[PDB]
Amino acid sequence: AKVVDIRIDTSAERKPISPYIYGSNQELDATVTAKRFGGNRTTGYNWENNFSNAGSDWLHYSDTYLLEDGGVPKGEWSTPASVVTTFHDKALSKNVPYTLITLQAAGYVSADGNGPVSQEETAPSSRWKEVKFEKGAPFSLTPDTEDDYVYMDEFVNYLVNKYGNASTPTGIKGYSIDNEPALWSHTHPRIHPDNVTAKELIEKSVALSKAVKKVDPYAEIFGPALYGFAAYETLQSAPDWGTEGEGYRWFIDYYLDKMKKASDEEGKRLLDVLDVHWYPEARGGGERICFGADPRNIETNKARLQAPRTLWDPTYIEDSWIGQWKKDFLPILPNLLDSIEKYYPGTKLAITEYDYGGGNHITGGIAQADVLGIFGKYGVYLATFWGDASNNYTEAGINLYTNYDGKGGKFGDTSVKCETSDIEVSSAYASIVGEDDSKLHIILLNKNYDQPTTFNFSIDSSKNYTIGNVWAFDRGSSNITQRTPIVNIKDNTFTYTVPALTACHIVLE
Ligand SMILES: OC[C@H]1O[C@@H](O[C@H]2[C@H](O)[C@@H](O)[C@H](O[C@H]3[C@H](O)[C@@H](O)[C@H](O[C@H]4[C@H](O)[C@H](O)[C@H](O)O[C@@H]4CO)O[C@@H]3CO)O[C@@H]2CO)[C@H](O)[C@@H](O)[C@@H]1O
Ligand SMILES: [Ca+2]
Ligand SMILES: [Cl-]
Ligand SMILES: [Zn+2]
């Protein structure tokens, strides 16, 4: 019999959980709290006519993909920014409080939707329009599609004119400085053939941020949307890192320090959120836990359940090149947060793309629930899962926090102290609402693969809990269903046995 003790103190370690950590990039069968318009297709997106380029994802085709995939009504295809206004309109209609829109910085955007762009048509060419951050002339709500430029501040002006600025209820709250710059030369060689330099990225980030904030001083700027660890460390061996990086432990520090320096010179914050993508490299059963992972491989599923620990646990070393060669930078969230504290205090942290895999398997659901608990506990500001609606268990993991009862019930927004005696077989996160502990929320995850786990709970609270309602998902179904309530609570202690591989949300009152 596996027995684990869970100890919670509702008065200790109280910290707000940002409401935006429960987001997505795609349209999911889950209640989300943030929507990001980003990814490869957004680098060459032209707001003036809605065309965009697939880059290496599909023969460098310039077409109407984003209009089609975004579900934009045909009659609006020629309307400026219809891809983005359709995107934000949808978010607003779903009561999503945060919309993050990627702006273009690689350099050029699609001039047309005429198909493949040849290598001989690498920008500049008739197939592209040059991006300029500041128009330097009066904005127009009807941008000229005949000239050679596309202006980012004019794009932002169009959105602010329509929705109000970021301080208002319907305004777009954040903008991203493009997408995965260290991969521009790989994903978008027809736009930016040369490997991005550290100097170039800072120059562009500062210039675009200034341009955006002159239009909407309340908008939050997100950067650099790094694809993965190699970019975090050296911006993918940036051509000038040997010189620019002198004295810096990794590119993350250089980016924060240089953005802080530019902000100090400008007189206002130019970087609001340090933004990175994290697709785990963790392996099990001979394969990575994401990207083509086989749900039949038990060792991979088991590795997926432990992988979230790389985000916070100093004692956990995953099986990957990062776990092997980059221990100095693990656990990853504390290292990113440490860098922020050292080089640009006050900067927020966001994970704008991530996927732990096994999306249609119970372990993908449990890992997703674990990751969200970790994001909340460690102070992540915004997070957006990258993956489609077929990831039913990932969606259950999100709904366990955002809509566990099907009627809007959600995890508390204030994290409180909650410790488990066995971090390998379980995870537990607790929260309350605001400053009130009248209702105590607990996400309890049993990672035991084939045996139930008995949990002995001990809670320190100003309230005496008498009932604990329960909602959970498991291998029987990704649908979250209400379970029999916990009723024998003695002096805020109780014992609850959970079946193998089950994710629960307990609400004590
Ligand atoms: O070209 C016409 C053709 O399009 C087909 O659909 C394509 C689309 O053109 C293409 O742009 C799209 O690309 C995806 C890509 O497949 C996906 O891997 C990638 O994911 C990246 C992400 O962008 C991140 O920034 C980072 O690198 O991590 C993630 C990976 O986890 O995003 C791209 C889009 O941004 O794929 C679709 C489907 O193949 C139509 O299907 C076809 O009918 C049209 O004729
Ligand atoms: Ca133009
Ligand atoms: Cl990158
Ligand atoms: Zn789904």
From TrEMBL:
Superkingdom of the organism of origin: Bacteria
Binding of Ca(2+) 1, residues: 48, 144, 147, 149
Binding residues annotated for Zn(2+), in chain numbering: 29, 389, 395
Keywords, in A-Z order: Calcium, Carbohydrate metabolism, Cellulose degradation, Glycosidase, Hydrolase, Metal-binding, Polysaccharide degradation, Signal, Zinc
Keyword ATP-binding attributed: no
Gene Ontology terms for molecular function: cellulase activity; metal ion binding
GO biological process: cellulose catabolic process
Protein family membership: Belongs to the glycosyl hydrolase 9 (cellulase E) family.
Protein name (Swiss-Prot/TrEMBL): Endoglucanase J
Organism, as annotated: Acetivibrio thermocellus
Gene this protein is translated from: celJ
Covered range of the whole protein: 775 to 1283 of 1601
